[PDB]
Scaffold this active site. Structure first.
Site, mmCIF file in Angstrom:
data_model
loop_
_atom_site.group_PDB
_atom_site.id
_atom_site.type_symbol
_atom_site.label_atom_id
_atom_site.label_comp_id
_atom_site.label_asym_id
_atom_site.label_seq_id
_atom_site.Cartn_x
_atom_site.Cartn_y
_atom_site.Cartn_z
ATOM 1 N N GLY A 137 39.597 39.761 36.891
ATOM 2 C CA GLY A 137 39.350 41.374 38.021
ATOM 3 C C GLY A 137 40.487 42.105 37.208
ATOM 4 C CB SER B 44 44.014 36.508 36.784
ATOM 5 O OG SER B 44 42.722 37.120 38.065
ATOM 6 C CD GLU B 45 39.744 38.269 31.169
ATOM 7 O OE1 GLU B 45 39.825 36.939 30.248
ATOM 8 O OE2 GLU B 45 38.480 39.059 30.684
ATOM 9 C CG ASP C 219 41.860 39.604 48.756
ATOM 10 O OD1 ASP C 219 41.019 41.094 49.359
ATOM 11 O OD2 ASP C 219 42.565 39.960 47.470
#
Ligand SMILES: COc1ccc(/C=C2\Oc3cc(OCC(=O)O)ccc3C2=O)cc1OC
Length: 331
Positions: free
Chosen positions: A47, A50-51, A155
């Site tokens: 994203g 973040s990863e 979400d």
């Protein structure tokens, strides 16, 4: 002329009668794990905060997922993780296996259950009317759970719902937008994916509650039973409202705007047009008929409601004939 206040119709004061420590994630003091326990195998996605990696637990050789966190905000980091911890053990809720203090960043990494995710690409041509029911139900349990636990997920969308179709494994992921409900509290509207945004967000109305999540889910259901991803396909937040008002219709919309003295940017007037409420029959064809049923249209018809206080709750949705058949339990 101000906007009329709103309360959660259920689970309103769940955090209200819980010890401060439960919802004050700011004062939470984290206890970190051993970052040398884990080796990163592949990147699985990234994203813009973040990863996500596929990882390995080198003490026992188990597969995990490692969310490393680009240097965001201490407040934001501890929220997700207080929430993740508050909900661990709940139905279909992704397990936070570990928390680790990370070099890559001057920030850390969270470690989760591996869910060997059937890809929503060869899932969408194997799934059956029963399957969806099963999965709708399982996600509902998760969403009743965390709602009862004083928490909106904010979400909901098919990517945050991993599914290992082979084991019938559904877990709900990505609680980085998730937040505690306190009644009276105005919230950020800039949460949730465009396609899955509730109207209260699209109309900039902040005193929302859990039932936002029922909206998102509700779009999902639509998607799956209608074989159209996403059901509501708008090109920005304005468009999106249009794409909703074309099936739900302009009347009830304007009555929703009426009840909460919600004032709408004037530009919205001309794009919004005048549209009638379409029958849910109208989107049944030959490719998606075998998944559509009166129970479904009706089930669905009770989630996609402009008025947030109108939407079914998780509890009530699980008690819907749509779910009757679902293999009813025991030892
Ligand atoms: C179809 O490609 C895949 C995509 C994702 C996965 C597995 C997972 O992706 C995740 C992302 C997660 O994000 C954690 C978060 O953002 O909260 C957490 C767990 C998993 C997880 O178990 C597995 C896959 O199969 C190779």
């Amino acid at each position: 002329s101000g906007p009329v206040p709103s309360r959660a119709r259920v689970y309103t004061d769940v955090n209200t009668h819980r010890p401060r420590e439960y919802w004050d994630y700011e004062s939470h003091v984290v206890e970190w794990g051993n970052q040398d326990d884990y080796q990163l195998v592949r990147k699985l996605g990234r994203g813009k905060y973040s990863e996500v990696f596929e990882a390995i637990n080198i003490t026992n050789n188990e597969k995990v997922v490692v969310k490393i966190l680009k240097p965001v905000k201490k407040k934001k980091i501890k929220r997700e993780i207080k929430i993740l911890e508050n909900l661990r053990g709940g139905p279909n809720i992704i397990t936070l296996a570990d928390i680790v203090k990370d070099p890559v960043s001057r920030t850390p990494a969270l470690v989760f259950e591996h869910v060997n995710n059937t890809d929503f690409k060869q899932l969408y041509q194997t799934l059956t009317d029963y399957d969806i029911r099963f999965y709708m139900y399982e996600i509902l349990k998760a969403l009743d759970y965390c709602h009862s636990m004083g928490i909106m997920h904010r979400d909901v969308k098919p990517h945050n719902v991993m599914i290992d179709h082979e084991h019938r494994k559904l877990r709900l992921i990505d609680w980085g937008l998730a937040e505690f409900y306190h009644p009276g509290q105005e919230y950020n509207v800039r949460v949730a994916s465009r396609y899955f945004k509730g109207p209260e967000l699209l109309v900039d109305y902040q005193m929302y509650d859990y039932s936002l999540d029922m909206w998102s889910l509700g779009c999902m259901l639509a998607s799956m039973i209608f074989r159209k991803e996403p059901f509501f396909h708008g090109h920005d937040n304005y468009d999106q409202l249009v794409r909703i008002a074309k099936v739900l219709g302009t009347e009830d919309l304007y009555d929703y705007i009426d009840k909460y003295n919600i004032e709408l940017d004037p530009r919205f007037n001309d794009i919004l047009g005048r549209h009638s409420r379409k029958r849910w029959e109208r989107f049944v064809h030959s490719e998606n008929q075998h998944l559509v049923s009166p129970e479904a249209l009706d089930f669905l018809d009770k989630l996609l409601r402009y008025d947030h206080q109108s939407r079914l709750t998780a509890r009530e949705a699980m008690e819907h004939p749509y779910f009757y058949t679902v293999v009813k339990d025991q030892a």
